[PDB]
Enzyme design. Sequence first.
Site, mmCIF file in Angstrom:
data_model
loop_
_atom_site.group_PDB
_atom_site.id
_atom_site.type_symbol
_atom_site.label_atom_id
_atom_site.label_comp_id
_atom_site.label_asym_id
_atom_site.label_seq_id
_atom_site.Cartn_x
_atom_site.Cartn_y
_atom_site.Cartn_z
ATOM 1 C CG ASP B 25 -1.972 1.084 1.136
ATOM 2 O OD1 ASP B 25 -1.893 1.906 0.201
ATOM 3 O OD2 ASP B 25 -2.868 1.115 2.008
ATOM 4 C CB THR B 26 2.058 3.416 -2.778
ATOM 5 O OG1 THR B 26 0.812 3.579 -3.466
ATOM 6 C CG2 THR B 26 2.858 2.309 -3.443
ATOM 7 N N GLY B 27 -0.180 4.131 -0.288
ATOM 8 C CA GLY B 27 -0.909 5.186 0.381
ATOM 9 C C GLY B 27 -0.887 5.129 1.892
#
Lengths: 99, 99
Positions: B25-27
């Site tokens: 999850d890059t967020g």
Amino acid sequence: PQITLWKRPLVTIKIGGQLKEALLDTGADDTVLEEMNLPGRWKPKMIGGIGGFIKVRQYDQILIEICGHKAIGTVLVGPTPFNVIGRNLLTQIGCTLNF
Amino acid sequence: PQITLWKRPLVTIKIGGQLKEALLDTGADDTVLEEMNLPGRWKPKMIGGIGGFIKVRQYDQILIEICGHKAIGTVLVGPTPFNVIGRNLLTQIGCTLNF
Ligand SMILES: CC(C)CN(C[C@@H](O)[C@H](Cc1ccccc1)NC(=O)O[C@H]1CO[C@H]2OCC[C@H]21)S(=O)(=O)c1ccc(N)cc1
């Protein structure tokens, strides 16, 4: 481009003729943007995050430009902590994860 | 490897001698895992996203193996709907976004 993750993957997007900052978010199925005026019809929808569910306005077939790459898809507008670009649009611009 | 985003980027991880599935999850600033009884001390923390905030337990210097790539750092534990590997560990396994 190749984007490392030492800081947030924040990019400039263009939507409805306006520029905004948004987070490339591979953990998001859908694209959720902060409150804003968008043209066209919309339908009430619900979306769930880490903290529960929120009410959003669903706009279909919206043109967004992400770092020059064009995408046309669903955009949800509501009280999100941050403009998040989700997989529905990340796929359109050919985004992948690589390690 | 290269992970496309047609579907959720779920991978197998190894933490505290247990195998789990987690989003890359890059967020997510920091890694958050579903409730689990890790040993050692921890600090209370609250993290927020779509829907509001949840309370989590912050453990430090936890070893996690992600697709055979070892990483060690902060792991938050709480009632998250999903295990998410955040940037604090994604950087350690050499993960990038590419388009
Ligand atoms: C909203 C982001 C800025 C931050 N989030 C990570 C994000 O990827 C979550 C991660 C996520 C994923 C699934 C369930 C809950 C949270 N995805 C999400 O909210 O997506 C929603 C829009 O698309 C839909 O698809 C998933 C839920 C919907 S977060 O889960 O709230 C979060 C915040 C802080 C930390 N340290 C770790 C995670």
